[PDB]
Amino acid sequence: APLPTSCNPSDMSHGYVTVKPRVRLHFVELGSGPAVCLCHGFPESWYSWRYQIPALAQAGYRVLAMDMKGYGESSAPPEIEEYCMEVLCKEMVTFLDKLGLSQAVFIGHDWGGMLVWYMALFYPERVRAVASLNTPFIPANPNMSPLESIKANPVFDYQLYFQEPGVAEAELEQNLSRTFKSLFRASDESVLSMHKVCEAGGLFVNSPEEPSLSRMVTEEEIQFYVQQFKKSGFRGPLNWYRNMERNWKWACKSLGRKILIPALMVTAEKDFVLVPQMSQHMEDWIPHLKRGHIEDCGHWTQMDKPTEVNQILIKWLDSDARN
Amino acid sequence: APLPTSCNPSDMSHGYVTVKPRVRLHFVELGSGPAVCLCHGFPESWYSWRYQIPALAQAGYRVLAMDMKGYGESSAPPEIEEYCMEVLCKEMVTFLDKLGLSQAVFIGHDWGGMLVWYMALFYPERVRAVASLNTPFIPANPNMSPLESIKANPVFDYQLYFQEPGVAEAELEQNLSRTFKSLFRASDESVLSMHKVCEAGGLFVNSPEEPSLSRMVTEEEIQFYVQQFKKSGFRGPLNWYRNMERNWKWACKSLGRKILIPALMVTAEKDFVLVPQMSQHMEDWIPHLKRGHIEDCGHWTQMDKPTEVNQILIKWLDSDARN
Ligand SMILES: O=C(CC1CCCC1)Nc1nc2cc(Cl)ccc2o1
Numbered sequence: 001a002p003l004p005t006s007c008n009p010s011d012m013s014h015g016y017v018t019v020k021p022r023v024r025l026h027f028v029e030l031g032s033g034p035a036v037c038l039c040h041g042f043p044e045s046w047y048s049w050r051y052q053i054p055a056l057a058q059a060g061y062r063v064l065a066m067d068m069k070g071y072g073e074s075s076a077p078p079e080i081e082e083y084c085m086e087v088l089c090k091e092m093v094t095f096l097d098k099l100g101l102s103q104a105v106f107i108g109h110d111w112g113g114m115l116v117w118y119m120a121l122f123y124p125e126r127v128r129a130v131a132s133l134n135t136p137f138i139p140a141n142p143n144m145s146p147l148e149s150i151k152a153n154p155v156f157d158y159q160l161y162f163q164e165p166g167v168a169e170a171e172l173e174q175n176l177s178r179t180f181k182s183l184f185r186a187s188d189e190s191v192l193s194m195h196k197v198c199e200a201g202g203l204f205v206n207s208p209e210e211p212s213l214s215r216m217v218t219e220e221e222i223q224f225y226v227q228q229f230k231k232s233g234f235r236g237p238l239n240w241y242r243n244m245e246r247n248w249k250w251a252c253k254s255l256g257r258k259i260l261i262p263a264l265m266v267t268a269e270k271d272f273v274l275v276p277q278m279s280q281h282m283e284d285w286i287p288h289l290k291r292g293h294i295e296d297c298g299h300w301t302q303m304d305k306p307t308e309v310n311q312i313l314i315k316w317l318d319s320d321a322r323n
Numbered sequence: 324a325p326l327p328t329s330c331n332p333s334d335m336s337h338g339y340v341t342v343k344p345r346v347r348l349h350f351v352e353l354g355s356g357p358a359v360c361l362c363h364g365f366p367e368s369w370y371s372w373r374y375q376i377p378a379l380a381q382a383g384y385r386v387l388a389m390d391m392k393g394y395g396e397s398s399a400p401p402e403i404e405e406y407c408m409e410v411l412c413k414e415m416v417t418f419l420d421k422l423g424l425s426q427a428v429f430i431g432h433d434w435g436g437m438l439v440w441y442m443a444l445f446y447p448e449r450v451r452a453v454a455s456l457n458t459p460f461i462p463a464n465p466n467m468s469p470l471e472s473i474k475a476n477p478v479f480d481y482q483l484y485f486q487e488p489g490v491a492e493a494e495l496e497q498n499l500s501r502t503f504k505s506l507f508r509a510s511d512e513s514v515l516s517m518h519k520v521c522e523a524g525g526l527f528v529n530s531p532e533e534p535s536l537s538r539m540v541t542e543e544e545i546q547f548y549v550q551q552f553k554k555s556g557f558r559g560p561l562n563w564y565r566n567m568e569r570n571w572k573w574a575c576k577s578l579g580r581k582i583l584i585p586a587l588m589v590t591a592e593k594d595f596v597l598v599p600q601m602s603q604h605m606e607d608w609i610p611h612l613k614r615g616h617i618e619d620c621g622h623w624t625q626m627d628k629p630t631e632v633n634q635i636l637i638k639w640l641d642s643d644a645r646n
């Protein structure tokens with residue numbers, strides 16, 4: 001099961017779409033057939049889709065690989081508010097408007113996973129079928145705020161560390177080769193102590209200055225993600241985490257609402273931040289849910305087990321999405 | 324029959340695709356469904372499609388409005404050779420490669436009409452159905468060269484005037500407001516003496532310094548085509564006309580070949596350079612030919628009779644192309 005076909009940057013079709021005067025979302029496009037929009041997570045890029053991009057096109061689908069707001073080619077407005085769920089979601093609909101797409105299958109991962117879930121909650125007419133990698137669908141509770149929730153689970157302390165503007169940026173921007181080589185790694189090859197990131201005084205303080213090259217990614221691929229963040233940097237990508245109050249209230253404006261479109265949740269066994277058990281009760285709010293699970297898969301789902309992901313995604317699109 | 328919906332530049336999806344290191348073709352994209360590539364003529368732009376673009380999308384087609392090599396956003400290599408039929412055609416296939424499109428309906432006009440005809444002759448597997456506006460399909464004759472052909476018909480003397488590099492450029496670039504206001508006009512509103520352009524010492528020498536605003540186009544639209552040519556200029560656009568020897572030989576490499584894919588020729592009654600009678604015998608080389616004709620239509624077919632064009636195009640796509 002060797003690694004499948006990838007994507008070379010200068011051999012892609014780069015599309016650009018302004019959805020607001022100051023906001024221009026970029027993307028890569030390949031294939032013909034039902035539109036399938038791919039949204040990455042933090043701190044990825046459209047590149048993290050390089051294995052499923054050509055395969056999805058191959059299966060008979062149009063692939064719009066999103067370069068999510070703040071990341072890379074896309075616009076990066078320094079304002080925190082420009083990254084609250086509401087704005088980001090609304091711009092996606094606008095993205096479809098400009099392209100003249102009535103609907104589109106939305107497949108996200110990590111933050112993009114959160115993104116595509118709400119894009120299925122508040123804009124069903126716009127989403128054909130929704131699929132999420134690692135990120136489960138938890139309906140915001142009215143009585144409990146992110147305050148005592150992100151402080152309930154010990155791993156989430158890294159997020160409180162992210163809240164403060166500029167702190168996590170200086171570190172994350174300090175060494176891009178290291179930062180990305182340290183991050184993109186299979187579970188068994190970890191280094192990050194998502195235990196006490198605040199007490200440690202950073203997320204890399206307890207790690208090698210020159211980590212090795214993970215078995216998942218090559219040197220070149222790491223260099224691509226390096227040149228990518230040399231533009232906007234991290235303030236944008238990190239801002240997604242900084243709008244918790246807003247995302248909370250906005251999500252309460254739906255309460256007894258359920259996702260009724262074809263949905264598929266893909267749990268990754270070895271992911272410690274987004275553990276497969278968080279999606280346990282999803283079946284309730286999504287009566288039209290189909291499951292997926294990848295063994296020996298870490299957080300970076302696409303880079304980790306590319307052949308598995310493409311097998312599950314394609315099989316699900318052709319039956320539930322494709323119609 | 325008021326003028327149909329148009330296209331606003333900043334509200335479009337601008338895609339870019341490099342097909343050679345030094346060549347990057349731009350385009351606008353709108354709609355979902357069978358891919359339909361629109362190619363303009365000289366000296367137009369993707370904008371000349373503004374009326375059929377949203378309509379074609381509306382009818383259920385994906386619209387790739389090409390910003391043809393040399394014009395506007397696209398790369399403009401000063402070398403003449405970079406505009407010979409062969410190169411231009413080959414890059415289009417490469418354009419499909421990069422986007423991952425096995426086939427695409429090709430609709431051209433003027434030079435793009437010549438373009439899409441050869442793209443149907445030498446690359447059938449790549450063209451679903453071909454349609455040309457004004458430009459008929461004349462199979463290059465082995466015995467007769469463009470020498471005594473472009474010198475047979477009196478109107479074509481403007482082309483011999485184009486051959487010399489830089490001559491027609493200085494004039495065409497001299498006043499873009501005038502140049503384009505003088506050009507984009509209905510037949511009854513002419514000014515251009517395509518009689519003796521060489522003896523006159525130019526194509527505008529015998530015309531008003533401040534021509535009026537044609538009933539077809541607004542001031543803004545003229546200003547768009549003005550800012551467009553403020554980049555590359557005209558050397559590129561004019562170079563298309565400068566590769567006659569090559570286009571001749573290259574076209575001889577097919578002789579007894581016929582276009583067998585669904586084809587549609589649209590003749591425009593009032594066009595004096597591309598008279599509807601030039602297409603008379605096309606029926607022979609194209610056994611699968613369907614006809615179209617627009618009354619009171621000048622050379623600028625799309626701007627002139629936008630409601631007619633969209634009626635013919637759509638009706639033909641849904642039956643022959645769409646499959
Ligand atoms: O923060 C998220 C995603 C959200 C959790 C709830 C909804 C989506 N995951 C997440 N936090 C990361 C930290 C690092 Cl250093 C690297 C990758 C990460 O992915």
Ligand SMILES: O=C(CC1CCCC1)Nc1nc2cc(Cl)ccc2o1
Pocket residue numbers: 365366433434437458481506526596597622
């Ligand atoms: O150049 C063509 C058509 C091709 C050459 C013969 C068949 C295809 N027509 C053509 N020559 C023009 C000159 C000016 Cl100044 C303006 C518009 C023109 O359209």
